[PDB]
Amino acid sequence: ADIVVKCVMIGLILASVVTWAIFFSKSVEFFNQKRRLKREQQLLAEARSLNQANDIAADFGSKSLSLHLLNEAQNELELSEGSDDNEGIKERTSFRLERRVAAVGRQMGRGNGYLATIGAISPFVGLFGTVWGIMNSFIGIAQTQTTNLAVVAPGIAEALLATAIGLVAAIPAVVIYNVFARQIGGFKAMLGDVAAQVLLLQSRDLDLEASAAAH
Amino acid sequence: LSVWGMYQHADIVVKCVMIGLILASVVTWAIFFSKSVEFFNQKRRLKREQQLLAEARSLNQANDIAADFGSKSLSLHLLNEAQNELELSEGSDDNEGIKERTSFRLERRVAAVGRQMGRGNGYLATIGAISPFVGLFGTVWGIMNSFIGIAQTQTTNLAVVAPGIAEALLATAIGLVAAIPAVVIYNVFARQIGGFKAMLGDVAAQVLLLQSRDLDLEASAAA
Amino acid sequence: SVWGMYQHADIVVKCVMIGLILASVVTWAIFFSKSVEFFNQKRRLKREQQLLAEARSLNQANDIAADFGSKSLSLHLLNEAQNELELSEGSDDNEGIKERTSFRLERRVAAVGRQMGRGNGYLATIGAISPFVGLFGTVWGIMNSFIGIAQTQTTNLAVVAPGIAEALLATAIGLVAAIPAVVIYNVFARQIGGFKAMLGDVAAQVLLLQSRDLDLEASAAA
Amino acid sequence: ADIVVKCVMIGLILASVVTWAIFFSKSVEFFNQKRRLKREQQLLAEARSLNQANDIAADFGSKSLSLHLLNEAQNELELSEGSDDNEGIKERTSFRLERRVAAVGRQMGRGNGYLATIGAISPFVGLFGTVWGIMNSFIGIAQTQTTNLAVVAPGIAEALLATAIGLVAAIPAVVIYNVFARQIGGFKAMLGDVAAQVLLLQSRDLDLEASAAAHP
Amino acid sequence: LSVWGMYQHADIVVKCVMIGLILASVVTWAIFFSKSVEFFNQKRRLKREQQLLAEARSLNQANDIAADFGSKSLSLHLLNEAQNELELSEGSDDNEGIKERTSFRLERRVAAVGRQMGRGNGYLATIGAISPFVGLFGTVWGIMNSFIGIAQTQTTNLAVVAPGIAEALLATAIGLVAAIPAVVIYNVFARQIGGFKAMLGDVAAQVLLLQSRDLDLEASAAAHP
Amino acid sequence: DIVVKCVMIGLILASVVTWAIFFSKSVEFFNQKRRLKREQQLLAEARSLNQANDIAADFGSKSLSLHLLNEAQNELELSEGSDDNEGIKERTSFRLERRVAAVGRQMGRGNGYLATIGAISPFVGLFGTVWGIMNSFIGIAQTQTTNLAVVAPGIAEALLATAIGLVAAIPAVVIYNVFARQIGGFKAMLGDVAAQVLLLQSRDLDLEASAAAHP
Amino acid sequence: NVTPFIDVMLVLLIIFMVAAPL
Amino acid sequence: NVTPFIDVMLVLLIIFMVAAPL
Amino acid sequence: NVTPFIDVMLVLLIIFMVAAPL
């Protein structure tokens, strides 16, 4: 019945709206990109040489991140043309693929901290909403000489309901964030399954080259 | 006073979220009894094949044992990865790079199987987190009725009030049954997955020892 | 109203309320300063990263970074890399060069991450203690309510209305000061984490340029 | 007046005052530490050799802790005279400097746990004397007796005043402890920058000595 | 009025509560005044021996300093562990394994001495745990006796509950008197034992440093002339 | 009241649980405490793993030190012919920390139940009390009395429930803390034993490699 | 922690106590 | 764990409930 | 730190003190 109750109510409601909006957007985001990563890994698992892996990745599409990994590997081939130190090439390429896997894991992390802050702050605006709902459950009590609580038993009530507006907006999102802490935990390892294999496809094809340069 | 009678004593939102409580509990028990017998069967199969391959002293002997391991036999998959690093690295002089790449692929596959063991466990930790808290929210809607009811009755006594008492007791005794076994089952699943990964790493280290000794004998014959 | 209930105060309610609102003003001012500061720094850093993503040797990176500006942190990283070139003149261990230089980059990225962290020490304290000082103002307001009862010496709900209600108001304003400080602190924590990650990307690029140039120079030496 | 209530009142008062005094003393001394350390690091961030850093730090004072770090590095130079492994020198020196930085950081911790202790234990008493005064209020009103809320309120007010004194003792002690914690953390990181620079100096000169002695 | 007087005016279960509370308080005071001065003497001896061993330049020089440290000199025990790892490694070629084993044993001895410090602190933790509990039991017992005294009579006032409120909140009070200083003593013991373990880590670190110096100089003497 | 008597019996059952856990855990602590101390005192002068087995030949089957030596002998025998001995040391340290943590976990049972009982007990005694207070305020609001004398026995027999909850709660807390400390000291001693085993393997592998260095 | 399960019990005590002055 | 943040809320419910029988 | 274990005890003191004025 006062402006602060209404403002904290609409803040809790809009916070829950933004919560479920980011939830259902990033849900199909994670699902589509994880399914694409899984099927592209199952395609790339049959490569025996590096140019064979280029022939496998010739039809993956431009935003295929494993194709970008093979671009990284071909880039470390083409920058280091004319050298005799394959070991420094392998060290730099390992470091680059580490940083690219970490970079993709950072790009997946965007929007998650939004939900983390919302699920962390939603208890605090929720408890303040219970607070000002209690102030309105009150002062009219002692203004109108209310001793019988039966005329203010719906007045008391209902501040509890502001807790109810809190918790569903507050609690599972962090858990969803924790869900999104683990799916990315399933993602970055799965991505990490591929790129160092990109090393191995190089690591043999350099070692099969220099040994071919040995005899 | 029965459970479904107290369910009749409540209203719509706590009805819906107690349905959510019991569905989360049922899927928790279902994931438990599925993954338990799955872990048991895979432990028996891995212990069987480990006691088989503990007698092998060469990689050719390991393939001769592994000729009848099965399609999804993980030790045969490890020997297939080792055979793949044999066949891809044909014509090289750096056996140590072969051993490094082989150990790296075996660490990769042990990590892959350890990730394969933990599919439902994310939902298990999810339920073990949320069960006291969804029990708290179900408590909140199930309790915002005694205010209304005794505002209706003007009667402050027994069975007017006491099914609300038994209603809250039921509404998070279900939360207890959803909360404590979920955490306990997740911790013992973490225990069994850790033991499975330890045994699998032992098997992979055994495969590394077999291929390393055979490559050392080949390099000593080359010298 | 707010100011009428402020007129219902004794001195300590007034002092804790002005402490609450001045801490709130400090919080919002820190936010609106550091927000546009972080936006400008992140914009410049992402732009310079997209510029330096095309460099392939270190002198090419000097050619690109000749116009980045004085406080360009990527140019500062290139200054550190040039310093480690000049201090390694006459040496023969490129691995030690890379160790020293990577270690300096670790320390400098840590230093810039500390440069980002100013004022957050105020923010964590304010967001921590603000519910507690709201509770303290609540306690003093409840004490003023009992002081008003001791002045009136009667038992009445109209007696206990204004002091209890104003302690409730102090409870409200304590949380009003409490919430956005925690908001802004978590916001700036995440943004500084992402900033340090992007700076580490830039320093990784510097290390890759240095490592390619040193290894191709060592390959040309043989 | 109430004897045990007044005793825990003055205990909270003395605890609050010594938190004030610890804040002032550690603030002034640590501020001078920060000023001198930032000045000395801005001086030392330009040398090209360790002996050049000795030439810079000869101008420094006696309790210049960076000069103490250089003394530790010179001690590892002098104890390794006639040695052949430079990596062992670098490992010993790195671990000595980690040890010394940890020792300085624990010397920063002198008295902070008193602050944390008092900020923890403050909301306990105050409520203690509140309970004692409310008990004495019930005893007095019962031996005089009444059935109203009018007579019971001044004892409750005098009781909750002790809880207010407990909160006064509680909150700024926690404030001072956490700001001392994070400013000492930044101090430790700045000292780690300095000792890192010392390690880089000795590493540069060891590597250049090895490169000069490898090719005569 | 007097504590012996209100002890007399209290119920016998409340009497048992109060005597348990004051015995726990007395043993808390006793553990504090014992461990404070014992730990202070240990810290004084440790700082003395560290200021002595700060100038040793070889491990045998450290033995020459440590020949007159005393029986239970823990730094001398650290040097005994180092000499044990010297004597067990006779016939080996890896100095790094020596350093690993010795650092591991000395970290374990630091942990062992730190656990030997903590004898009696969990008594203090248990006291700080259950100090409100028996006092709250006597509190509820006294309020129950108040309602027993109201029920035994046929009238009521505040004069019946006032000795019972006195007993109840007084039992709560002595529960807090047992609670808070036990906590404070546990605070300072935990902190000072942590700093003591840190200083012991400094001393054993210096021991590892000296042994590393002598291993590196022996390797430099053995490798190149 | 029957609900009051039901929570009385619940307090009694939780107390009997506390009794039984104290009995079983205390009789296993008193037996398996000093034996590992005596065996560590014996193995303080082992100086080699074979002489450690010569000391350990009479330790018995249930000697956990003998189980750790079984693990060490297992890692010796499975790794016969291995040139890499540091990997043997790493895998053996992994198995020993796994075994020591497994013993600490398997003897840490029965204690979370104690923590929950010592937490919950005065609270459910409090609700038994406040249900006695229900029957008291029912007597007040139905007999319309301003008299406390006709209603005091309900509140007294009520407060009996909180008293019995405190009775159940105290020994659970005490026994839980002291058994947690005894488990901590037990794990410390067992880690000392496993550390000594690692020292034995390190000494023998280093001296074997040094003997294999020069003939 | 298995400690915060007392909250529903607190709610139950409270919404007992709403009925008792009525 | 981000779970124990309910404690201040518990305190707030309780010190609501101190005022309601008054 | 083994110090913050006093919180459940604080909660127990408080929810004693909810019952005593009733």
Residue numbers in the entry:
A (entry chain D): 19 to 233
B (entry chain C): 10 to 232
C (entry chain E): 11 to 232
D (entry chain F): 19 to 234
E (entry chain A): 10 to 234
F (entry chain B): 20 to 234
G (entry chain H), H (entry chain G), I (entry chain I): 19 to 40
From the paper:
The Ton complex is composed of three proteins ExbB, ExbD and TonB located in the inner membrane. It utilizes PMF to take up diverse compounds such as iron-loaded siderophores, haem, and vitamin B12 through outer membrane receptors. ExbB has three TM helices with a large cytoplasmic domain, and both ExbD and TonB are predicted to have single TM helices and a compact periplasmic domain. ExbB and ExbD together form a proton channel, and isolated ExbBD complexes show ion conductivity and cation selectivity in vitro.
